[PDB]
UniProtKB/TrEMBL annotation, chain A:
Signal peptide: none annotated. This is Acyl carrier protein. Carrier of the growing fatty acid chain in fatty acid biosynthesis. The keyword DNA damage does not apply. It comes from Chlamydomonas reinhardtii (Chlamydomonas smithii). Residues 6-80 form the Carrier domain. GO terms for molecular function: acyl carrier activity. It comes from the Eukaryota. Belongs to the acyl carrier protein (ACP) family. The chain holds residues 33 to 117 of 117 of the full protein. The modification Phosphoserine is found at S40. Keywords: Fatty acid biosynthesis, Fatty acid metabolism, Lipid biosynthesis, Lipid metabolism, Phosphopantetheine, Phosphoprotein.
Automatic annotation (TrEMBL), chain G:
The chain holds residues 99 to 492 of 495 of the full protein. It comes from Chlamydomonas reinhardtii (Chlamydomonas smithii). This is ADP-ribosylhydrolase ARH3. Belongs to the ADP-ribosylglycohydrolase family. The lineage of its organism: Eukaryota, Viridiplantae, Chlorophyta, core chlorophytes, Chlorophyceae. It comes from the Eukaryota. Residues 156-180 are annotated as: Disordered. One of its GO terms (molecular function) is poly(ADP-ribose) glycohydrolase activity. It is an enzyme of class 3 (hydrolase).
Length: 85, 55, 55, 49, 55, 33, 394, 97, 49
């Protein structure tokens, strides 16, 4: 229901940073995924790492349209939002 | 209370404890003992006399 | 109180301390001195009563 | 009024209520056994209690 | 009565501040020390502008 | 600007932004529960 | 019109008057340290215009005695006139001397036998300055104690929650506080004809051991620059001596930091001028005092200038608002509470080093004479101000 | 909430308490608590704020927790400025709503 | 009430920012409240009267 987008965004940024090797203050809330040192067979590894960090399941169509760390954080927040129901 | 107010320059709840006491006495001044000038002399058509604590 | 005071002759302060340990009550920690407000207010209360009585 | 006469109970001593530091120390010790985050600024938590 | 008291207190401001300063240090005074302190600061002989504004 | 200068208690109190009239409604039953 | 009195003031009476104005400002504003302006103007309904005798703080000031801030200022001035320039070890020894004499100590009560004895000086010192200038005596180094302090005075730790620093208790007393900017008027007057970069080197040397931060150095620099500017000036040029002149001159050359420039610009474009105040009870309840207090609340946080930038901006407001009336300016500065000793002492230093000597009322001179400092301290001040008018070795 | 009355909880599912607390009723509570905290911040010498919150225990009210010092007015003093500031802070919520 | 309304009116931006923060976080601390309010330029009161 009521989810804190701040914490989710912080931790998504941390996970992306730790996954690619780029320092945390460089990955901006709107930085796309190819410009930060990642191809196509590496945006799926960070998807897997995100699921592993939050222990949720990502919807697949919504995962086909992820381009900014903001939309990733928003997808994850929407997943955690609808958990009990 | 008036001394605290004249030192600080601002009201307080200290006055709250003063005037209460004074008000009791002031009523006993006007009604029961008949010291005032309420009527031309200080005799008033109604007073409230105390009961003993034995009650 | 006087024998703890290192003396033996009872002074006014000592009999005053005794009266107060029964008339009022046991002693308690003093007033904080971190801010000017508390002691200023209470001391102004006391000195106003005393000064007005004397006048 | 009987047990107060001289010799029987001649001295009364007063224990005040704790302060910020007192409450801080009190809660520090009652938690040694519990599971507690190490970075707890016990003083600040005692300021609001 | 309130006007009378407030007129007493707003003449002896120096004496009241001397008393507060003395009582803040020792937290205790006897009526004789208080009397001599108040005596050391007699009231104003005449009224200047500030005194008129206070009155 | 200084919209708070023209605040009137008789003619009605209103902020600057235009009337956030968002609302939706189910029936009385789906509202009570 | 403006302050005329005598003609154009010289260059010796300027310095002695700066020290005298600092003295009267600190002594007058000492008892009102750490309270808001509405409280101060309600305790002193007839104006803050005379030396208070009855003080009931935790460490009470006595009648006619200054605090540690003026002690440090005058010690800086003397030691500077001794080594003929800002030499760090010399003035630091002089400061620890002024912090040492007359004092005393108290012992401890700790279970294991731990001993952290408390040294109590004979005056009032800021807790950060007390700590740093007693760590100097603690044997440790003089240059890298600020690095122990910035992280020691960090009792703020997390301050989890708890919003405003309203309590002077939760305000930041440390390497970026007002300590440095408070003692930079005599320094900035010893260097009135030396060049801006040399002046900056001097004021930087005087700070190295306590205020290494850049914003504290900026505060010290702007106050020293104002001191030098008004020192070179003369009180008669109705065009050279204008507040706009000094403010723009500050904005262009010296002010480099962001927030300092913002506060200076804000003070510049909203500046106004008070008319001559004769009845303080009516002034303390008028549109003018209210407007001034509104600007003052803009320039600071809840009426408390702890950071050097707020401090220096507040100092210029009290002085530039009474252009041509130095005693009125020092009264207005003492009437604002907060850090009233430091604020008013700096305003008085600058009013002296600009206007000179003929403005200190006779009653404040007599009050300095009748206090505990007495003739000894009074003419010690006038003599340390005389032995400053010409010293320029190195 | 006692023998009956009630009408204050918001998460019980019964005819009294709606289940998700509609959004127009959450905007209002947030506006209320924001106005109250904003006025308590800009008021000189008010208490200090420790934690602002909305919907505690699902009730339809906010809750602002205030840290205060027991040694400025030792459990006994009330000055006029303080009372007027309290009045302003208590009307701020309704006024912002 | 006049003072409350005037002080909420001259602080409109900070009021809306803090409202949004409360709507999307649920809880907030005093340091965060201070930071949010000072980031949007609050205009304090001069006195409590």
């Amino acid at each position: 229901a009521a989810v804190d987008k701040a914490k989710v965004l912080e931790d998504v940024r941390s996970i992306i940073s730790t996954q690619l090797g780029t320092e945390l203050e460089k990955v901006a809330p709107e930085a796309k995924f190819v410009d930060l040192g990642a191809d196509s067979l590496d945006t799926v590894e960070i998807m897997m790492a995100l699921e592993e960090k939050f222990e949720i399941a990502l919807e697949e169509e919504g995962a086909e349209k992820i381009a900014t760390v903001q939309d990733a954080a928003d997808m994850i927040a929407a997943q955690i939002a609808a958990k009990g129901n | 209370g008036f001394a605290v107010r004249t030192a600080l320059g601002e009201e307080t709840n200290f006055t709250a404890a003063d005037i209460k006491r004074a008000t009791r006495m002031a009523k006993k001044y006007v009604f029961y003992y008949g010291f005032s000038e309420a009527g031309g002399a200080g005799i008033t058509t109604w007073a409230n006399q105390p009961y003993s604590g034995d009650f | 109180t006087a024998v703890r005071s290192g003396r033996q002759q009872l002074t006014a302060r000592d009999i005053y301390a005794g009266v107060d340990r029964f008339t009022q009550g046991e002693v308690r920690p003093s007033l904080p001195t971190a801010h000017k407000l508390p002691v200023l207010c209470f001391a102004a209360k006391e000195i106003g009563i005393a000064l007005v009585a004397g006048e | 009024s009987a047990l107060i006469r001289p010799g029987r109970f001649d001295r009364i001593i007063y224990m005040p209520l704790p302060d910020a530091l007192g409450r801080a120390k009190i809660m520090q010790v009652h938690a040694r056994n519990k599971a507690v985050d190490p970075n707890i600024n016990w003083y600040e938590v005692a300021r609001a209690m | 009565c309130s006007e009378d008291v407030l007129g007493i207190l707003a003449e002896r401001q120096e004496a009241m501040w001397a008393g507060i300063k003395a009582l803040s240090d020792r937290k205790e005074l006897l009526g004789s020390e208080l009397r001599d302190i108040f005596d050391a600061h007699p009231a104003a002989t005449s009224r200047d502008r500030d005194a008129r504004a206070e009155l | 600007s200084n919209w708070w200068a023209s605040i009137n208690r008789k003619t009605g109190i209103r902020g600057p932004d235009p009337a956030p009239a968002e609302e939706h409604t189910n029936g009385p039953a789906r509202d009570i529960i | 019109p403006a302050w005329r009195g005598p003609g154009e003031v010289g260059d010796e009476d300027k310095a002695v008057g700066c020290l005298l104005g600092a003295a009267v400002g600190n002594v007058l504003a000492a008892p009102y340290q750490g309270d808001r302006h509405f409280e101060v103007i309600r305790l002193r309904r007839n104006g803050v215009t005379d030396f208070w005798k009855y003080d009931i703080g935790a460490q009470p000031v006595q009648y006619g005695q200054y605090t540690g801030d003026f002690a440090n200022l005058l010690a800086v001035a003397t030691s500077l006139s001794a080594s003929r320039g800002v030499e760090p070890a010399h003035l630091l020894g002089a400061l620890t001397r002024a912090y040492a004499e007359g004092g005393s100590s108290v012992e401890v009560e700790d279970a294991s036998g731990g001993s952290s004895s408390g040294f109590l000086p004979a005056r009032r010192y800021s807790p950060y300055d007390r700590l740093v200038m007693d760590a100097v005596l603690a044997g440790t180094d003089p240059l890298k104690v600020p690095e122990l302090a910035e992280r020691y005075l960090a009792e703020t730790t997390r301050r989890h929650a708890s919003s405003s620093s309203d309590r002077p208790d939760r305000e930041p007393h440390g390497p970026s506080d007002l300590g440095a900017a408070a003692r930079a008027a005599p320094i900035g007057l010893a260097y009135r004809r030396a060049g801006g970069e040399r002046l900056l080197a001097a004021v930087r040397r005087s700070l190295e051991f306590s205020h290494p931060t850049p914003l504290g150095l900026d505060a010290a620099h702007v106050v020293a620059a104002a001191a030098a500017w008004c020192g070179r000036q003369q009180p008669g040029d109705a065009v050279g001596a204008t507040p706009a002149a000094l403010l723009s001159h500050l904005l262009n050359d010296v002010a480099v930091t962001a927030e300092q420039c913002g506060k200076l610009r804000l003070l510049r474009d909203n500046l106004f001028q008070l008319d001559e105040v004769t009845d303080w009870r009516a002034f303390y309840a008028g549109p003018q005092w209210a407007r001034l207090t509104a600007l003052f609340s803009r320039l600071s946080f809840h009426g408390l200038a702890t950071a050097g930038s707020e401090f220096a901006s507040v100092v210029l407001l009290a002085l530039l608002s009474s252009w041509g009336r130095p005693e009125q300016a020092v009264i207005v500065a003492a009437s604002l509470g907060g850090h009233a000793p430091a604020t008013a002492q700096t305003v008085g230093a600058l009013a002296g080093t600009l206007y000179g000597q003929s403005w200190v009322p006779e009653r404040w001179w007599r009050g300095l004479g009748e206090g505990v400092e007495g003739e000894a301290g009074r003419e010690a001040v006038v003599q340390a101000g005389r032995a400053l008018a010409a010293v320029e070795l190195a | 909430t006692a023998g009956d009355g009630g009408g204050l909880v918001g998460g019980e599912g019964v005819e009294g308490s709606p289940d998700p607390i509609p959004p127009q009723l959450r905007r209002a509570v947030s506006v209320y608590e924001a106005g109250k905290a904003l006025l308590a911040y800009i008021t000189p010498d008010y208490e200090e704020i420790a934690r602002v919150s909305v919907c505690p225990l699902n009730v339809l009210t906010g809750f602002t927790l205030f840290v205060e010092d027991e040694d400025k007015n030792v459990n006994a003093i009330l000055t006029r400025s303080e009372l007027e500031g309290r009045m302003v802070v208590h009307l701020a919520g309704r006024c912002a709503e | 009430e006049a003072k409350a309304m005037y002080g909420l009116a001259i602080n409109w931006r900070a009021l809306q920012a803090l409202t949004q923060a409360l709507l999307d976080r649920g809880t907030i601390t005093g340091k965060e409240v201070a930071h949010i309010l000072e980031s949007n330029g609050v205009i304090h009161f001069p006195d409590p009267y």
